[PDB]
Amino acid sequence: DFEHAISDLEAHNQAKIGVALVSENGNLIQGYRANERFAMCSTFKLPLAALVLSRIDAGEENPERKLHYDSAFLEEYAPAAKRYVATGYMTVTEAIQSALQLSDNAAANLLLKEVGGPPLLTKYFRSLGDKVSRLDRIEPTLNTPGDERDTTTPMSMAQTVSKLIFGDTLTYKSKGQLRRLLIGNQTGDKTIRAGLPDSWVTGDKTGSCANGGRNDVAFFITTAGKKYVLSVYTNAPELQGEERALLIASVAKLARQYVVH
Ligand SMILES: *C(=O)[C@H]([C@@H](C)O)[C@H]1C[C@@H](SCC/N=C\N)C(C(=O)O)=N1
Ligand SMILES: [Cl-]
Numbered sequence: 001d002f003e004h005a006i007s008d009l010e011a012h013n014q015a016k017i018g019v020a021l022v023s024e025n026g027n028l029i030q031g032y033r034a035n036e037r038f039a040m041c042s043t044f045k046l047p048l049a050a051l052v053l054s055r056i057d058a059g060e061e062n063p064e065r066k067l068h069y070d071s072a073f074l075e076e077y078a079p080a081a082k083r084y085v086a087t088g089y090m091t092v093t094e095a096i097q098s099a100l101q102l103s104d105n106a107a108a109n110l111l112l113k114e115v116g117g118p119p120l121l122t123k124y125f126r127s128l129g130d131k132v133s134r135l136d137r138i139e140p141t142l143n144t145p146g147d148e149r150d151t152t153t154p155m156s157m158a159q160t161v162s163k164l165i166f167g168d169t170l171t172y173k174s175k176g177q178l179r180r181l182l183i184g185n186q187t188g189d190k191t192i193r194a195g196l197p198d199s200w201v202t203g204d205k206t207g208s209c210a211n212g213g214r215n216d217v218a219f220f221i222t223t224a225g226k227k228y229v230l231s232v233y234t235n236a237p238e239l240q241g242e243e244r245a246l247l248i249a250s251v252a253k254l255a256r257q258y259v260v261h
């Protein structure tokens, strides 16, 4: 069974693995450590992008709005922001695309400023019925034992993402935009979607975090038209990076045994 298979993976890789596979409507299909906390150092950007789109939906923001910043605002991993910084700004749209598809840290910080900071994103999680996920600090500060700051659970994240991608909190327009952006993610070619058939439509947001953290949350649609979200959080400090991605792809190959192909 699923729980024994993931346990075997933990023991073989000296890793901690948390995973939830949920239906289109957020209902759990299989999981393993599904209600344990993991650091949410990058995957928070997915719900962050959705908050920004929902502000646009409500007329409180628009896509072409210029988010001003200078070199002091740069972070160590900010490939897009470093290219645009001489101009003085990134638009809302550029920052959303960069934070999602490149996991650009300065772009994510721009979007955090836009929405009112970590507390307003936490309020957004709560508003969507996610009682667990919380963001407290900005990049890269958000990345000790017992500290619940900047954490999610595999279940909370899968459920949240399922609501954003497949539910009705975003308009049809925004939901389409968010999905197309996630499909075009550039950082997830070796993670969850490497463990799924290539004919399935898949979009994802990855993360790489302290203590050997390598995470991915994806939506996918099988050739039968059946829609799912898979969250995978891993800590495998003895594995190399290519091996950590392969571990996530292995988890997805296990989880897909439980979906209608
Ligand atoms: C999440 O947003 C990560 C933050 C915490 O740095 C970010 C890092 C990239 S991994 C490649 C960059 N290497 C060193 N900093 C990442 C991602 O690709 O998902 N997320
Ligand atoms: Cl369902």
Ligand SMILES: [Cl-]
Pocket: 039, 040, 041, 042, 043, 044, 206, 207, 208, 209, 215
């Ligand atoms: Cl993450």
